[PDB]
């Protein structure tokens, strides 16, 4: 007879009405993804259209039930999430125009042609050798041509489209009553109405900058080492002191520095831990790999897999008869259905990816009890940190030797420790400044501090300063350099990757402290501990029931993220790098202009 009772009844009907449609849509999507035909794509299209129509109709129906009148806290979260993903605002020929703009951007990003140097002929694409040559090329001029060619072909047309996109997106954000669209994204890390545990949108930026300024020393020293090694390798192309020129960091965009390996290894004499040979020696199999993953995940103290998973999974390429998109995903069809779409190739890397994906699946099983609107995990970084911690703890030489793939007579040395730490750092710490720069620049662009005419120059100046890399060739207002990123082209947030590292390292430190293990944490495991399992599972149960601050307290015992776990992880590398860089001088000088 009361408003909260009415809301409870409405949600009670909504959950059971929506689960069936969501299951149908996700099943159709899975069928299309494993089987790409016209009938499948049409089925997925109509199913998605029906699901969207039902969601928007329900959200419009949810216009009543004022929140300030609502007393129960858990009801407010469901109602707010429903209102947020159901709000349809602005007018026709505007919303539809924006949707068409997004579709055109996706199509033009998918279709990218570089053609041939100064010769109109057959044209490559990023999935073909276009990025492969950047990954494995040692020719400076060849890298020069392709790196500028990609931006030359794509971005010039995207510039006005991106301007109109920004204008319309801010137009919608104004109607959503948020301060701006940067604030719209920043509203995810928000908790209000709870004493002690609360988070506003303002604190996120200051926390990010504080963490970055705490991290800067180690990144500076690693940059100095990388510059020294690159000067040793590439002759007469890099200034001894100054910004590090592009085209050499690896990858099309320089986000990850892993391809830069095999050229800056300190001790190449010692063999790598890579144990892909033993798999083919003992005749391993994908079934065996996934069974080993299940054995680890049940030894830590968590439930095994399901027969439905084992029988409906998708692990090995069927062949040329049926075409599938080989990319690891952990689907959650609902109604107690879980399966993987992946193509194992019997490698140590594939073994690590299996342990990575099974973590997401176990998290999905963990939060299955909570209501539909609260199923998705609290925060957008937790669900990736939980996946990554298993990968960190599943690649240790101790774990490999215990499994048996490693040679029982193998011994660990500080040289191998340095090699492993450097290889890990090249990916773990390299991406943080890039992510921070990209998110900060996009935030400022949305907010409007930077005028349009100064976008390119300010972006390139920021790239010169923060990450110490200089543009090789002049760029003007015609070019749109950041538009080449898939994430910025397809409207995805990007600070989740920045929060992921901090969350995973805090989780790992807490777990390895719970399971008594001395020595450096860089070689730790939780294979045979039944306490860390409970510590994890307690937070995994909640979902969005409790604020992420409370979840973090329950897990580690702290209130907010800190870089102390990461620095503790990377102490030996810091000391060794300081020892190596006695003669060299760290830092950079943006005044030097090889651009000029």
């Amino acid at each position: 007879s009361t408003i909260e009772e009415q809301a409870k009844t409405f949600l009670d009907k909504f959950n059971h009405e929506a689960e069936d449609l969501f299951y149908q849509s996700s099943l159709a999507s899975w069928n299309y993804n494993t089987n790409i035909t016209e009938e499948n794509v049409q089925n997925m299209n109509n199913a998605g259209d029906k699901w969207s129509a039902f969601l928007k109709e329900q959200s419009t129906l949810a216009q009543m039930y004022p929140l300030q009148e609502i007393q129960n806290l858990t009801v407010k979260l469901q109602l707010q999430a429903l209102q947020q993903n159901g709000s349809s605002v602005l007018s026709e020929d505007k919303s539809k125009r924006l949707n068409t703009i997004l579709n055109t951007m996706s199509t033009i990003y998918s279709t990218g042609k570089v053609c041939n140097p100064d010769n109109p002929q057959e044209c490559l694409l990023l999935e073909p050798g276009l990025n492969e040559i950047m990954a494995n090329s040692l020719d400076y001029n060849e890298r020069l041509w392709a790196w500028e060619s990609w931006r030359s072909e794509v971005g010039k047309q995207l510039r006005p489209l991106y301007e109109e996109y920004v204008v319309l997106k801010n137009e919608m954000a104004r109607a959503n009553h948020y301060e701006d669209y940067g604030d719209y994204w920043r509203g995810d890390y928000e908790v209000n109405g709870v004493d002690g545990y609360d988070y506003s949108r303002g604190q996120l930026i200051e926390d990010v900058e504080h963490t970055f300024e705490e991290i800067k020393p180690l990144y500076e020293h690693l940059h100095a080492y990388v510059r020294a090694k690159l000067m040793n390798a590439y002759p007469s192309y890099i200034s001894p002191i100054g910004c590090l020129p592009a085209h050499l960091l690896g990858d099309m965009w320089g986000r990850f520095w892993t391809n830069l390996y095999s050229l800056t290894v300190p001790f190449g004499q010692k063999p790598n831990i890579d144990v892909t040979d033993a798999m083919v020696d003992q005749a391993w199999d994908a079934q065996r790999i996934f069974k080993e993953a299940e054995k680890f995940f049940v030894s830590v103290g968590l439930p095994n897999m399901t027969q439905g998973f084992w029988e409906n999974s998708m692990l090995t390429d069927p062949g040329n008869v049926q075409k599938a998109v080989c990319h690891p995903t952990a689907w959650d069809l609902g109604k107690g259905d879980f399966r993987i779409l992946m193509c194992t190739k019997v490698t140590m890397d594939d073994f690590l990816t299996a342990h990575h994906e099974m973590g997401h699946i176990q998290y999905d099983m963990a939060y299955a009890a909570q209501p539909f609107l609260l199923r998705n995990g609290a925060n957008e970084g937790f669900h990736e940190a939980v996946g990554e911690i298993m990968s960190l703890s599943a690649a240790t030489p101790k774990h490999l030797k215990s499994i048996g793939l490693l040679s029982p007579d193998f011994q660990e040395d500080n040289e191998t420790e340095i090699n492993f730490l450097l290889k890990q750092a090249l990916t773990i710490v390299g991406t943080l400044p890039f992510t921070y720069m990209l998110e900060k620049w996009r935030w400022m662009v949305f907010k409007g501090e930077i005028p349009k005419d100064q976008w390119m120059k300010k972006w390139w100046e920021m790239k010169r300063e923060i990450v110490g890399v200089v543009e090789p060739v002049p760029h003007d207002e015609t070019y749109c350099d950041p538009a080449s990123l898939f994430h910025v082209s397809n409207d995805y947030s990007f600070i989740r990757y920045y929060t992921r590292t901090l969350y995973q390292f805090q989780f790992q430190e807490a777990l390895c402290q719970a399971a008594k293990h001395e020595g450096p944490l860089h070689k730790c495991d939780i294979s045979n501990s039944t306490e860390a399992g409970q510590k994890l599972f307690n937070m995994l149960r909640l979902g969005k029931s409790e604020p992420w601050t409370l979840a973090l307290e329950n897990v580690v015992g702290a209130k907010n993220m800190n870089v102390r776990p990461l620095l503790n992880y990377f102490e030996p590398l810091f000391t060794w790098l300081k020892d190596q860089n006695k003669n060299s001088f760290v830092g950079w000088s943006t005044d030097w202009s090889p651009y000029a």
Partner: protein, 193 residues
């Protein structure tokens, strides 16, 4: 050699919904209780009062068998004293009850890939049922303080809701077929035995 018709209720094509659970009374026949072992391993076999080890040696006046199809986790709510949606609204057992309850998994004949929709249950009512009563009347549920016509629309909800069954559903959502055996001694002066 005048056997009771247990085989008829157990092996049947359809079992009907929950809110309209069927009832059947049988008397004056030779009890066998051997057909129960001609089925797949039962998901749950709990007996209250009588014991299957002795079973047929007892006497009784009347016996009732009720059958209906429920979903997975809902089996646990079928108990002498418990609380839940199905026990509060769809089908209720008295606290001072004796008998046996039988349920086995049946996700091979009641589920279709297109989605079975011939099974329903009630999830919106008031006046939690007194034990052993059936409510089949369907009317638009009143919510709020507004007169409500035949059309539901807003703030008025149509009760009852379908399960939906598919072969790929996980365990705990697969259909289950339950039969509950209820009989009494009739402690009052009884003519028969």
């Amino acid at each position: 050699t005048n056997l009771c018709p247990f085989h008829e209720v157990f092996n049947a094509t359809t079992f009907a919904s929950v809110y309209a659970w069927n009832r059947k009374r049988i008397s004056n026949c030779v009890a066998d209780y051997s057909v129960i072992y001609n089925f797949a391993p039962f998901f749950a076999f709990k007996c209250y009062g009588v014991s299957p080890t002795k079973l047929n040696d007892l006497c009784f006046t009347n016996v009732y068998a009720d059958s209906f199809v429920i979903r997975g986790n809902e089996v646990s709510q079928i108990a002498p004293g418990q609380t839940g949606n199905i026990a509060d609204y769809n089908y209720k057992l008295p606290d001072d009850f004796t008998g046996c309850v039988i349920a086995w998994n049946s996700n091979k004949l009641d589920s279709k890939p297109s989605g079975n929709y011939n099974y329903l249950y009630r999830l919106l009512r008031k006046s939690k049922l007194k034990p052993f009563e059936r409510d089949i009347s369907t009317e638009i549920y009143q919510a709020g303080n507004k007169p409500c016509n035949g059309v539901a629309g807003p703030n008025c909800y149509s009760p009852l809701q379908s399960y939906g069954f598919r072969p790929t559903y996980g365990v705990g959502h697969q259909p289950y077929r339950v039969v509950v055996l209820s009989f009494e001694l009739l402690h009052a002066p009884a003519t028969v035995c």
